[PDB]
Amino acid sequence: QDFVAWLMLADAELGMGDTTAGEMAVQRGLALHPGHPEAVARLGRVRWTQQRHAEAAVLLQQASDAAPEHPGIALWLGHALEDAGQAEAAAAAYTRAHQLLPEEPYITAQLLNWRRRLCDWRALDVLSAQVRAAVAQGVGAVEPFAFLSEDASAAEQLACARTRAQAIAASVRPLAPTRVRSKGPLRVGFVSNGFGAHPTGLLTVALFEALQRRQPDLQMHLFATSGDDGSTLRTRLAQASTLHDVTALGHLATAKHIRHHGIDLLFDLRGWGGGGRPEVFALRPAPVQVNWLAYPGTSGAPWMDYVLGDAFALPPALEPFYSEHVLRLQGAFQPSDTSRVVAEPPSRTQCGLPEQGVVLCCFNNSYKLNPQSMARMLAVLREVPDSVLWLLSGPGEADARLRAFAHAQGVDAQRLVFMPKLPHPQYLARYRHADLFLDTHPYNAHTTASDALWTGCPVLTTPGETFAARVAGSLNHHLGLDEMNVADDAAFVAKAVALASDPAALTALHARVDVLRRASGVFHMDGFADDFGALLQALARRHGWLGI
Ligand SMILES: CC(=O)N[C@H]1[C@@H](O)[C@H](O)[C@@H](CO)O[C@@H]1SP(=O)(O)OP(=O)(O)OC[C@H]1O[C@@H](n2ccc(=O)[nH]c2=O)[C@H](O)[C@@H]1O
């Protein structure tokens, strides 16, 4: 009935879902102390869960100014500003929070991830080390998907995944166990928040179309954790399966809904990313659970039975670093939308390129563009006189930093061209102007590598020692382009330099990409469906399914 109780009751009704049970309380905190950093910040915090981000930043910014020593606040300010699309000021707040809590791993991880996204490489080495050590000591505050950006072995990655999983598993009682059906068509489920204009939808669409057509004994179920975005993918995907909208259903309710349909094999296409909902899988709604295609590494999770990769991106040499039993498709692990008619792009000038000159490009998100990957790309521009680096536009002053670094490396900043965000059909068209795609290490082009190749642009890569660092390589290998996989950085530059400065050889290579594009099984979704569908049937029998 008075007073820190007030703000208290707000702190866990709110992050327990029920927010106006919550609201009613802060507003009464304000009742006792009118505008008080600890209270203010909290109004602020409702707004945020209430999706009213814009209001939040202003409130939080007032509190912060009155309490520039308060790190709880600094963190909430950052969250807000971030979700109010103020990238650079969001990192500012995260920085101050870190100043104020050096040992707090959660905060260190946050700031490392946010800095990579802005290519702010200040003290990166230290930050990276810290974050890895936090994984190492099993206090992994570290979010596994962000963790993919660090130069960590498959061992550390497994450590980081199993840490998080085990925390989730402890906080949760599974559903009563069940078993794969003996008789009758196989119910195969896929959960994701990518069923629309997102990588996941974009890679699986033509696959599921093919499955509907070719594997009529497999009953496909898609469990959409995101609403309809009005894209052709969402429609196409809803056309090729039974698509359940489970958006804004609780973890529990979703599992219960998955169970209600008797799914036999449930694929997680989420994965440890945003919009995840791992706690959904922890409830074991299905008797056999599989990790595939969405998160490029191990789940760590004991609720995860299998992982699906391929002989290249998940070689036997890597098997021990996955908690799942490993399964493999007959070619690349990644499917793609081979219905895509690549449009003609607007001319070079309209795309902001010069007319003459070799155009190298890399369209990965900013967090993949790390010191090592950039240096090596710029290393190519130096030796090739004419040439040009085409990149995606990133948030905040990321582009500015890259320019400054380019100059810091001894390259005219005018030589990097920044494509803004374009809807898929128009973006994809931009590849016809690119001469060579320059991959990133340790976090490869995934979907984009596939995009690039589909339009006929070759991808140069350095297959590393983890799954995420071998995705570009798996495509090149399964395409038959083994000379696009090079041993190391020096070989990369050497190879790309040789290519760029020899237009003759370069054109031969585009030509060769084309043949393989249509010849190999990598881009032959019918074949992919057959393989996939057959692997599913076997897996089920190995669990008790008696077909028919
Ligand atoms: C950054 C982040 O936390 N999440 C996401 C992602 O979840 C999100 O849905 C996506 C926006 O749809 O941005 C990030 S891509 P990720 O790193 O996760 O994987 P990627 O293979 O990099 O995916 C490249 C995607 O962008 C497409 N893309 C890109 C640029 C453009 O201008 N147009 C476009 O369609 C490209 O065709 C492909 O569809």
Domains of the chain, residue spans: 1-142, 143-343+523-548, 344-522
Half-sphere exposure of 482 (CA within 13 A, CB side): 2
96 touches ligand 1 (CB under 6 Å): no
CATH topology identical between 1-142 and 344-522: no
Looking at the DSSP bridge assignments, the partners of residue 242 are 221
Query: Is 261 marked as binding a ligand?
Result: no
The burial class, CB within 10 Å (0-12 / 13-18 / 19+), for 530 is middle
Resolution reading in Å: 2.6
CA angle 384, 387, 390 (to 5 degrees): 135
Report the distance separating Cα 248 and Cα 267, nearest Å. Answer: 20
Q: Which of 370, 448, 451 to mutate to test the pocket of ligand 1 (most atoms within 8 A of CB)?
A: 448
Sign of torsion, CA 365 371 377 381? positive
427 touches ligand 1 (CB under 6 Å): yes
Give the C-alpha distances (Å, rounded to integers) separating 263 from 119, 289, 294. Answer: 43, 10, 20
A 10 A CB-CB count for 528 gives 25
Give the C-alpha distances (Å, rounded to integers) separating 89 from 42, 93, 399, 487, 527. Answer: 20, 6, 16, 40, 49
364 touches ligand 1 (CB under 6 Å): yes
Alpha helices by DSSP H, listed for 240-334, are 251-260, 279-282
Q: Tally DSSP H helices, then E strands, for the chain.
A: 22, 12
Taking the centre of ligand 1 as the mean of its atom positions, its distance from the CA of residue 388, in whole angstroms, is 23
A 10 A CB-CB count for 219 gives 18
128 touches ligand 1 (CB under 6 Å): no
Report the distance separating Cα 341 and Cα 469, nearest Å. Answer: 29
173 touches ligand 1 (CB under 6 Å): no
End-to-end CA distance of the chain: 65
Phi-psi category of residue 356: left, alpha or beta, with phi > 0 → left and psi -120 to 50 → alpha: beta
Q: Quick one: which atom of ligand 1 is closest to the CA of 427? A: 33
Closest C-alpha among 66, 118, 75, 124 to residue 100: 75
Closest C-alpha among 374, 409, 470 to residue 124: 374
A 10 A CB-CB count for 432 gives 14
Cβ proximity of 190 and 263 under 8 Å: no
Report the distance separating Cα 536 and Cα 533, nearest Å. Answer: 5
Cβ proximity of 245 and 228 under 8 Å: yes
Q: Which of 83, 143, 193, 198 to mutate to test the pocket of ligand 1 (most atoms within 8 A of CB)?
A: 198
Taking the centre of ligand 1 as the mean of its atom positions, its distance from the CA of residue 296, in whole angstroms, is 15
* CA 111 to chain CA mean position, Å: 18
Q: Quick one: which atom of ligand 1 is closest to the CA of 419? A: 32
Q: 28 Cβ partners below 8 Å, 6+ apart?
A: 6
Phi-psi category of residue 520: left, alpha or beta, with phi > 0 → left and psi -120 to 50 → alpha: beta
231 touches ligand 1 (CB under 6 Å): no
**Residue holding tokens 């399966």?**
241
Cβ proximity of 407 and 379 under 8 Å: no
Half-sphere exposure of 50 (CA within 13 A, CB side): 17
Taking the centre of ligand 1 as the mean of its atom positions, its distance from the CA of residue 422, in whole angstroms, is 11
Task: Count the residues in the chain.
Answer: 548
Looking at the DSSP bridge assignments, the partners of residue 219 are 187
Domain 1-142, CATH 3.40.50.620 — does that match? no
Q: Quick one: which atom of ligand 1 is closest to the CA of 449? A: 21
Strand order in the sheet with 459-460: 416-419, 388-392, 359-362, 436-438, 459-460
Q: 546 Cβ partners below 8 Å, 6+ apart?
A: 182, 183
- Closest protein CA for atom 39 of ligand 1: 199
Fold of the 143-343+523-548 domain: Rossmann fold (3.40.50)
What one-character DSSP code corresponds to residue 175? P
**3-state secondary structure string, 366-403?**
HHHCCHHHHHHHHHHHHHCCCCEEEEECCCCCHHHHHH
Q: Before 271, cis peptide (omega within 30)?
A: yes
Does residue 460 sit in helix, strand or coil?
strand
Report the distance separating Cα 112 and Cα 319, nearest Å. Answer: 29
421 touches ligand 1 (CB under 6 Å): yes
Does residue 195 sit in helix, strand or coil?
coil
Q: Which CATH architecture describes the domain 344-522? A: 3-Layer(aba) Sandwich (3.40)
Query: Is 244 marked as binding a ligand?
Result: yes
Does residue 52 sit in helix, strand or coil?
coil
Report the distance separating Cα 499 and Cα 507, nearest Å. Answer: 9
CA angle 230, 234, 237 (to 5 degrees): 160
The burial class, CB within 10 Å (0-12 / 13-18 / 19+), for 344 is exposed
What single letter denotes the amino acid at residue 360? L
Radius of gyration of the chain (CA): 25
A 10 A CB-CB count for 265 gives 23
Q: Which of 114, 231, 365 to mutate to test the pocket of ligand 1 (most atoms within 8 A of CB)?
A: 365
Phi-psi category of residue 332: left, alpha or beta, with phi > 0 → left and psi -120 to 50 → alpha: beta
Cβ proximity of 543 and 263 under 8 Å: no
Q: Quick one: which atom of ligand 1 is closest to the CA of 197? A: 12
Taking the centre of ligand 1 as the mean of its atom positions, its distance from the CA of residue 448, in whole angstroms, is 8
